[PDB]
């Protein structure tokens, strides 16, 4: 892939029933808690976390790279105060795809203060195919897909220096 063209496929403001405004000190911005910019951390809005549902027909004219995530809490109380229910799921589905993650609340070593983890997965969505997210807990939804704008022989060099 020689060039990506970012597309807003599942805009953050659509999530009218959940809290789209997460964050942590681990993703800090100016000392203030932030998060990944292309990701949305759907949490509960006042007690409830109803079924989160998302969809996108790939009408952008090329294959599209899409990333999503599930959140693995530390204790049960994290789980309840973030998603209300225990025992949730995070289904993603296309035509080549049918993944249904279910979350693993379990204590762990503090990386960046956090004994909790986000597990991220990914797919290519073919032209005119349709991606569906449905969850009742722990989804970290995408906001964007990347469209493959330029294809060609490229590479990734593992250098630790800079360009002249």
């Amino acid at each position, epitope marked *: 892939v020689k060039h990506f063209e970012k597309v807003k496929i599942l805009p953050k403001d659509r999530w009218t029933q959940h809290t789209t405004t997460g964050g*942590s000190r681990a993703c800090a911005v100016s000392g203030n*808690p932030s998060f990944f910019r292309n990701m949305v951390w759907l949490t509960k*809005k*006042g*007690s409830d976390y109803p079924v989160a549902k998302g969809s996108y027909n790939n009408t952008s004219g090329e294959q599209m790279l899409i990333i999503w995530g599930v959140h693995h809490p530390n204790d049960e*109380t*994290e789980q309840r105060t*973030l998603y209300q229910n225990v025992g949730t799921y995070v289904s993603v589905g296309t035509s080549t795809l049918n993944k249904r993650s279910t979350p693993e609340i379990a204590t762990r070593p503090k990386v960046n203060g956090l004994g909790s983890r986000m597990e991220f997965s990914w797919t290519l969505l073919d032209m005119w195919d349709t991606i569906n997210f449905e969850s009742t807990g722990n989804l970290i939804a995408p906001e964007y897909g990347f469209k493959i704008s330029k294809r060609g022989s490229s590479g990734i060099m593992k250098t630790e220096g800079t360009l002249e």
Partner: antibody
Amino acid sequence: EVQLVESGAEVKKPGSSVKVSCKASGGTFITHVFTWVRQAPGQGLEWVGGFIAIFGTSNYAQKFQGRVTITADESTSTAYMELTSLTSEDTAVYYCARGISGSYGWFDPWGQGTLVTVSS
Amino acid sequence: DIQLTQSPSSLSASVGDRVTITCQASQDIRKYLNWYQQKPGKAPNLLIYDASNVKTGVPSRFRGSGSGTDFTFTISSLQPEDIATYYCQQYDNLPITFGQGTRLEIKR
């Protein structure tokens, strides 16, 4: 039964600043969201802002920007509202109340309030 | 910002009467609407959350209704310890707003 213990009453001269407290007692820390609603004598209810334990993020009402600053202390399960450049319009009772979720739920329980009185 | 516009501004009613109060919103706020009571001298107190839900220990006579932009709060039979001001509040959006409040007195 989660209880709320909020700081004593203050009389401050104008242009100074106040910092009020809310210790949340009877439940675990990160399930907490702290919110502050002020209320002037005779008028009614006005949101100041609040703080979400689980994300450590604070929210202000744009009315107060620059002056209000919210923090917390997990050791104490104690949150803090600090209003600066106080004018006599800031005189009100300042209730702390516990809400729910990142969207500030409903507010229960409410503390009994901290009378701040701004007067030269 | 979302305007919560509560009517009537005051309400004299006899005891045993049913009182209804309304709270209208500048926007669709789904059922993201709660209802407070502030008796004179006391702190506000939650009576109803998510438009229709009644907090435990609130007596039966309090009911909450309303779904989109218009909301209704009803005491079925006014009881002399109900005279207070009542507030509504919204989440959904975020600068968190209250109504201006509705004052319950008794008709004599």
